[PDB]
Amino acid sequence: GNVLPVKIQPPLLRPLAYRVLSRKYGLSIKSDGLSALAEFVGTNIGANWRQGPATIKFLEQFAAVWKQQERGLFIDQSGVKEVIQEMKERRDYFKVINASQQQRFSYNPHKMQFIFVPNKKQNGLGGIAGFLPDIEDKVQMFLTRYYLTNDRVMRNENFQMSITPIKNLLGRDAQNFLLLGLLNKNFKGNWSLEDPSGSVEIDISQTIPTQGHYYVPGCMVLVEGIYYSVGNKFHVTSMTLPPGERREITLETIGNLDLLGIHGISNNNFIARLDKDLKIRLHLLEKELTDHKFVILGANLFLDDLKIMTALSKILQKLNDDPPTLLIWQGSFTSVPVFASMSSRNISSSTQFKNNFDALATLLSRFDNLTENTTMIFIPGPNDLWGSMVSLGASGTLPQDPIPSAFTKKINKVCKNVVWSSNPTRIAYLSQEIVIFRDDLSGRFKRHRLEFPFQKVQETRKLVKTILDQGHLSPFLDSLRPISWDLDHTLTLCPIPSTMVLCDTTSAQFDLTYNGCKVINPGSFIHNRRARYMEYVPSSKKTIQEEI
Amino acid sequence: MDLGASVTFRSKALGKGIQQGFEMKDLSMAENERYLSGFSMDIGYLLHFPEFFSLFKSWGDTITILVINASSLGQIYKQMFEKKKGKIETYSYLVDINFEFVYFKLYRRLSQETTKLKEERGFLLLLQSPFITKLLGTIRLLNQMPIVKLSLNEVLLPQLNWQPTLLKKLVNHVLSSGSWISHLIKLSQYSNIPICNLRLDSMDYIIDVLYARKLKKENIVLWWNEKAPLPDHGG
């Protein structure tokens, strides 16, 4: 109330509320809304019941505050909340999200529009098992990927010659054709292309591929050749990956959807859009961006060997005086995979893993500036608790679970901002979208390269070009990289984020940019008796620093 | 594996090879190992019970424990002395008696005691603690002598009357050290493995060594792997 509140009679305030909220604008004022207006009047007792403009204009402000929330046709106990919002309306605006909570959006080919999917966590029970995907999800996943790739191909400027479905190749021969589909091996052992219509075989003996790509099974390829009905051999004369698209032209086809929406979200009821605040946030980002710096480290920092702790202590000594905004630690934190212990005489693997993080809480006690001012990001590597416990340090499921809470009971208390996410994770800045993804790529694309019968800077060029043209984080089949049936949408590069953190221990560091996207390639944290970590300036500038 | 514990020379340049490091791949051969050596040499004894750091000297006669006890220590020592008189007599030729008792800022004495032992004797260390590598890294002098490790971890306190049970533990370890070292000597002089690289529970190590050397004598790649519980297949 005011300094001299007066207890009102609700009947004599009822007409003033009802007229304004039921004839000009607003509707369906509840009793709790009336009580909220009553206490607000108690906060405006000055010459009230005789003061016209201020009360009505504050009611108009109430309308301008509560119209945007839902639809504003009821006012519950939250009336005090909108009163507090009035008082408060009289770096933030950035988010970090993992693959578990990413919004689900299906695709429909016959309507050429994305469709929001209700979350199983929010409407279902989920008490016993709500995370188990259903049977047909894996059936529809490759269909969705093919739909997106076909849409991208059709939207190309050059393509307005037309492609032909596989099944339409039966009755014609000795004629050239163009077609695309999944590339893989059949049950027999030959090379085949798959389409929703059907599948055919591939002839490779006279194929000239477009250089600059990693032609790997499981990748969409544009195939040009001549059909032969003598057998079933499609004699290919050239092969090329589909081209990519830039972020602005991708968004403009869907206006500006709130897929990674921080200001607003969509649901099953309606669809959402916004572009007025985008320029405002862009210009806000253009200032004091040098102050909001964020730094990442190398991959596979092991918390068992003394040298890593010494180098990390030196790095923290240099970083304590000038705390950055985000400090991201990536890679596995234990040099040995954890699994079931067959020996009861020695220290258990789980206990060793738990102790491997307790000492970190002690080392963070002498860097109160970094702890206080900078947030913490931790990303699991290849052989952390959940993965190595079944995969034994080998490759496994991509939507990796976060570090268990039972093993990180001291980092959350010593530090004020600690975040654990999946292996692929998303951060949403004011005008930037960045993803961080830790795995091995160079070896995977080197060993499984297709053989065509017939200075290190080019390998990363080919890798970036392939990963961007294909537009998927895991351009591999289900045999190599098993993926959860539903979460595959988190692995898709449909929104094509502005910057990607390609962490690869098998590739040299690089700062390439292409197709409107900028890619960074952090290396291993320690190499050849040196320690290295890299910081990125949000103004499209990079710095690399090392401490022996 | 290839050289084993029984190594010898057939150079027929000893001074030049001893001032520098002597090369192996040109001169290498393993002699027989039916008997390793006639052991007569002092021992070391450093322990830790999660502040129960302990030390004892075979040739010394004093006991001090880091931060009723003395009488219990004496009576328990005498009691298990008569209990294992037979084992004591049989293994006296390996390790050989009453001694003083003491229960002592204080945590810097490990380095001083190790220095006193180092400049008083050359002697093999028996270490027992759940923090093997931590204690190895905290004391810089422990790296300059051969060490035989007897790691038996997972020791806890009953929150009450820990003194009698810890006295039992220490006394049985001390009076079974002779049997332990006899068993290790037997296993080493049978398996052609140096004494410091062996352990009572590391029975898989002997399997690995023998199988690997017999495959190396064959034409089969060992697929040997380290720090990873997977076979090596080339990536």
UniProtKB/Swiss-Prot annotation, chain A:
Residues carrying Phosphoserine: 474
UniProt PTM: Phosphorylated in a cell cycle dependent manner during late G1 phase. Phosphorylation may facilitate the interaction with POL2 or the activity of DNA polymerase II. Phosphorylation is independent of DNA replication but dependent upon CDC28 in vivo.
Annotated transmembrane regions: none
Main location (coarse class): cytoplasm
Highest taxon of the lineage: Eukaryota
Annotated GO CC locations: cytoplasm; epsilon DNA polymerase complex; nuclear replication fork; nucleus
A Pfam family it matches: DNA_pol_E_B
GO molecular function terms attached to this record: DNA binding
Subcellular location: Cytoplasm; Nucleus
Keywords: Cell cycle, Cytoplasm, DNA replication, DNA-binding, Nucleus, Phosphoprotein
Listed GO biological process terms: DNA-templated DNA replication; DNA-templated DNA replication maintenance of fidelity; error-prone translesion synthesis
Similarity remark: Belongs to the DNA polymerase epsilon subunit B family.
The protein's assembly and partners: DNA polymerase epsilon is a heterotetramer consisting of POL2, DPB2, DPB3 and DPB4.
Anything else known: Present with 3110 +/- 251 molecules/cell in log phase SD medium.
Function, as annotated: As accessory component of the DNA polymerase epsilon complex participates in chromosomal DNA replication. It is required during synthesis of the leading and lagging DNA strands at the replication fork and binds at/or near replication origins and moves along DNA with the replication fork. It has 3'-5' proofreading exonuclease activity that correct errors arising during DNA replication. It is also involved in DNA synthesis during DNA repair.
Protein name: DNA polymerase epsilon subunit B
Organismal lineage: Eukaryota, Fungi, Dikarya, Ascomycota, Saccharomycotina
Curated annotation (Swiss-Prot), chain B:
Portion held of the full protein: 1439 to 1700 of 2222
Record's function text: Catalytic component of the DNA polymerase epsilon complex which participates in chromosomal DNA replication. Required during synthesis of the leading DNA strands at the replication fork, binds at/or near replication origins and moves along DNA with the replication fork. Has 3'-5' proofreading exonuclease activity that corrects errors arising during DNA replication.
Subcellular location field: Nucleus
Free-text domain note: The DNA polymerase activity domain resides in the N-terminal half of the protein, while the C-terminus is necessary for complexing subunits B and C.
Name of the molecule in the record: DNA polymerase epsilon catalytic subunit A
Superkingdom: Eukaryota
Subunit structure, interactors included: DNA polymerase epsilon is a heterotetramer consisting of POL2, DPB2, DPB3 and DPB4.
Family: Belongs to the DNA polymerase type-B family.
More info: In eukaryotes there are five DNA polymerases: alpha, beta, gamma, delta, and epsilon which are responsible for different reactions of DNA synthesis. Present with 1970 molecules/cell in log phase SD medium.
